[PDB]
Amino acid sequence: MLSFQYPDVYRDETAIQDYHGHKVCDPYAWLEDPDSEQTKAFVEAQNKITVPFLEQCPIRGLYKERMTELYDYPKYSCHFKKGKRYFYFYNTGLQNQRVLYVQDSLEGEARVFLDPNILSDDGTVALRGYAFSEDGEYFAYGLSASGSDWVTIKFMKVDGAKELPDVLERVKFSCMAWTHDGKGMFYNAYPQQDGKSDGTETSTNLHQKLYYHVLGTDQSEDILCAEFPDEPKWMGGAELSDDGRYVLLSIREGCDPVNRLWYCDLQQESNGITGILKWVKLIDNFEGEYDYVTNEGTVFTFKTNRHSPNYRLINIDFTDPEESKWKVLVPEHEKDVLEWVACVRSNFLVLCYLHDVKNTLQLHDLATGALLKIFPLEVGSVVGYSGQKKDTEIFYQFTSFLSPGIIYHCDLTKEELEPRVFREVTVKGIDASDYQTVQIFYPSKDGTKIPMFIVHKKGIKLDGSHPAFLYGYGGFNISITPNYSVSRLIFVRHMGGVLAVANIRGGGEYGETWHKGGILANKQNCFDDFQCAAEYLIKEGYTSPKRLTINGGANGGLLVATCANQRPDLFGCVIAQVGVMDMLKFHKYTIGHAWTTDYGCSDSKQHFEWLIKYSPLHNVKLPEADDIQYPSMLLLTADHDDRVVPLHSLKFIATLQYIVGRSRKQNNPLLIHVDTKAGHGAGKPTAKVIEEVSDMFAFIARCLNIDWIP
């Protein structure tokens, strides 16, 4: 029969909970405890069968070698100036973590400023956030170990790259902002909690507070500047205005792009920062987002979505704060989303728009908002930018599906502006001209036209014979734009596959209306959109059900897992990374309470009724037809993923193996791989990234029996 046997997993049939009258059984509830011998044994047993399966066919080694070769290309970030020096991140190619360099001039020799690689043998300690003092002489940086969201903030004196004694603990989802007097830095921290705080715990994160750390002191001396004891879920991030006069507090609750905005005129403090600041509650509700751009005196420019779904720029004068008095600096565009805006060279605004899922970059006048210059870009994404108000030049990084980055530079002091190539890297082995990217719009179930990028070798016959890899996310106002992925291109070139990315609802591709189209009561829209994408690829002849692989991560993991339950006949392989699988209990762990803005919460009868319909953990069912089985599935998670606690995947795989894996007609494998010293994904070292993609494509290869193409 099969080559391996699924592990014995105890079913606690007494675990029954009542959700507003509906009895729900959770037989693997015990997997919620990561510290138990039972759970440890479970993980060990699952990995024991997954690893040999993935490593059996030599195609994995072929893929790993090719990935190690092709991924070995110089990787730079935009240069950015702080004080009298320039900084930039650079990875020579295969370093586990990118290194931060410093140079005293653009033509000067660069030296290593911060090398995270020497902090661990395996590169599992990574930089997570940083902040330079206004004068650029001091530097704060966060470090996370094993992929955890938890951070320890450390400090350095820039001149000489001197280590300082200051260390801040209990930092997570924190701001980092220095006051311009150079005395200290604002940051967020959570209260002491029982148990561990290393990324392996599941404990809910509440009561985050805003503190001020004076350089040269112990964290126990830190000043508490803002706290919301009556609102446990609020999170207040601080930033200083460009002139350093005001502390702007952005309070968020949940993941919607909205925030309260309070301010503190530092000059009005009785005796400096000594306790809870004299906050003026400018915007004291969660009805809209207000993202600070710059200010001229009391006139503050904010990027907002207040009655502007595609976003716009408005000016609020603190001296005449009523909404009826706000000035619209740059009106909302009928369809293009204003993604972000930066102020540079005092009176210039850099605006980045998303037009049909492709970026555009424009320069505008701060005083009038009028368009001054269009920066030419090919089809793709702007994924990096540098240029603060006092800077006189900008750098920006562009990427696409077929090419790594091109970093451009533009000296804004020249009357005739014209960006110039500053850095460009070419991957030897992947000739971009051999492939093509197309964008099509397909109708979903309800008729809504959804965009989808498709990348493939030029001149293929659309006869349905090609394996395909369809990616999707769908939620949280996140736009899935073009990105350079050598791993995916190896699938195209060496596995003869077709790549597709569906910009389903719930994302931010078409503004807040697109986001609202895939949340709460309408979450099913996401799944319908994605299923329709698969149907489009099949109908048009790009692939066939048995040769189609779907992939998503986190909320995207929820996407592909649900699609496997709803339309098992439509896919051949499903790879769900760090997915949210238990939609009834997600809100109980770590930062999960924040996702209720997209999903709702089971505590509500109304929400429960939406959730129970698509929750992956609660919708595993044998297909009715004798000729339909579940697709091959691979769940990927890690023991320090404190963003989406691994229990989601643990309970889901147990359920799949028991309900579906035991069926005689099920021949496709249902596996999970739980990595160690890793988390959700941010900061994952190069070595691990390579192993992961090798596991993914090896799985696809074995399940669909795809031959390697040298």
Ligand code: PRO
């Ligand atoms: O998608 C992610 O990365 C997690 C889970 C949904 C919200 N944030």
